[PDB]
Design a protein around this ligand. Sequence first.
Ligand SMILES: O=C(CP(=O)(O)O)O[C@@H]1[C@@H](OP(=O)(O)O)[C@H](OC(=O)CP(=O)(O)O)[C@H](OP(=O)(O)O)[C@H](OP(=O)(O)O)[C@H]1OP(=O)(O)O
Length: 149
Amino acid sequence: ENQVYSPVTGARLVAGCICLTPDKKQVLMITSSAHKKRWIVPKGGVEKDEPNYETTAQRETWEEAGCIGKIVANLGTVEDMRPPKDWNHPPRTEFHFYELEIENLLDKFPECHKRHRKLYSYTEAKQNLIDAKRPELLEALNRSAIIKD
Ligand SMILES: O=C(CP(=O)(O)O)O[C@@H]1[C@@H](OP(=O)(O)O)[C@H](OC(=O)CP(=O)(O)O)[C@H](OP(=O)(O)O)[C@H](OP(=O)(O)O)[C@H]1OP(=O)(O)O
């Protein structure tokens, strides 16, 4: 619709955040809208108007998790290497991830009724993304400044 794709791989361009607490013991996570039981991290599709990936990230973090913070690091890109449904390979999604230091969480936000939202230690957060079958999101988490204990 209004989405943007890599001119090389034709993959859909996404940006998101690893929203860490100030102490950096916990990371904010949200539930998928399609898969209502899977815990992921805030991200969404880049739109034409958006000048940089930081814009898409901070927007998507707000819309999806009602989270406000400053980007303290670029974590680089990870790919969603998901084989096409008629599989029985070019990547599906390129994600541009930033580390964000949480300044505030709001009780209202545009998908406050469509998603849940919780802070998880590195351990619980690792298992959640295993359960979710999203290792490219775990790769991003690992590039963060999160404490591993
Ligand atoms: O499920 C997947 C892809 P995967 O099954 O991991 O290969 O992602 C959907 C995405 O559709 P797709 O085009 O297949 O990537 C969904 O996107 C689309 O439907 C866009 P399109 O159908 O490709 O135009 C949508 O992703 P975006 O947030 O980036 O929009 C879904 O996110 P949701 O809104 O449910 O949180 C996202 O699910 P998830 O990341 O598990 O939460």
